[PDB]
């Protein structure tokens, strides 16, 4: 009843490649809070264009 | 409402420059950001140019960047586009249009077009149309119905007009969208059905007028 310690240590490769669709929808509170330096800069083409007003 | 009114366009040669203007009204001009979209056969719906309400920004597409030029006139409510060194690939529909008002961080796009206004880059110079007869005949006869018409062959530019019989024939009539020929010149064909017992003594004429070069052609079509 216990466990093989030689057994197969590798990853299957025929395992299952999609997406679990019962995995976490939440969103995660613990992730990254900061901003992203390398995030996009330059101004936005389609943003607004008219007064506030 | 809402109006947008463009003006300028015209027949310009390659090389040269041209300065379309747009007048708006129903809405405060100088509150909105504007676009210019052009309208080809070959290309669609293409963007050309966006311009902010204070003029700060400014937008091209690739395939104009560094030769257009969009600006605006607050105090006057009028928008403005100078489009130098025009190629031939630039002949299009016009349109001025306005942005749409929307939240902060929304992206934009336009509500409201304009009228619209024709630019044709060709070097094709002013040249009044050929008007020839299609004539009917037994070829051209199918029971009691027969078909006429005629050619209006190598003009430039466009557009022309056609009408029958000083415009009391309309019941049957065909005029085709002209197509661009390889030598620059316009050419388009209009044909009309009629009973085959009037051939032969009712007179069919074809009134040809073309304003920009005062043309006017009577052609009568004579069966064979």
């Known amino acids: 009843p216990n466990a093989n310690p030689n057994a197969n240590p590798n990853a299957n490769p025929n395992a299952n490649p999609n997406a679990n669709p019962n995995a976490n929808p939440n969103a995660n509170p613990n992730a990254n809070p900061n901003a992203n330096p390398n995030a996009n800069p330059n101004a936005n083409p389609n943003a607004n264009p008219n007064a506030n007003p | 409402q809402v109006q947008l009114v463009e003006s300028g366009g015209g027949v310009v040669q390659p090389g040269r420059s041209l300065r379309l203007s747009c007048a708006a009204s129903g809405f405060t001009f100088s509150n909105f950001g504007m676009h210019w979209i052009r309208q080809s056969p070959g290309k669609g719906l293409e963007w050309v140019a966006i311009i902010w309400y204070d003029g700060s920004n400014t937008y091209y597409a690739d395939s104009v960047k560094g030769r257009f030029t969009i600006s605006r006139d607050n105090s006057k409510n009028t928008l403005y586009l100078q489009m130098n060194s025009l190629r031939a690939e630039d002949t299009a529909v016009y349109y001025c249009?306005?942005?749409?008002?929307?939240?902060?961080?929304?992206?934009?796009?336009?509500?409201?077009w304009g009228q619209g206004t024709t630019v044709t880059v060709s070097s094709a110079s002013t040249k009044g149309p050929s008007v020839f007869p299609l004539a009917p005949s037994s070829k051209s006869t199918s029971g009691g119905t027969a078909a006429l018409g005629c050619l209006v062959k190598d003009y430039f530019p466009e557009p022309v007009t056609v009408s029958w019989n000083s415009g009391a024939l309309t019941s049957g009539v065909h005029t085709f969208p002209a197509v661009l020929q390889s030598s620059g010149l316009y050419s388009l064909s209009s044909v009309v059905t009629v009973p085959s017992s009037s051939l032969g003594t009712q007179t069919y004429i074809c009134n040809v007028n073309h304003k920009p070069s005062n043309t006017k052609v009577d052609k009568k079509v004579e069966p064979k």
């Open positions: 249009a306005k942005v749409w008002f929307g939240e902060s961080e929304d992206n934009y796009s336009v509500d409201v």
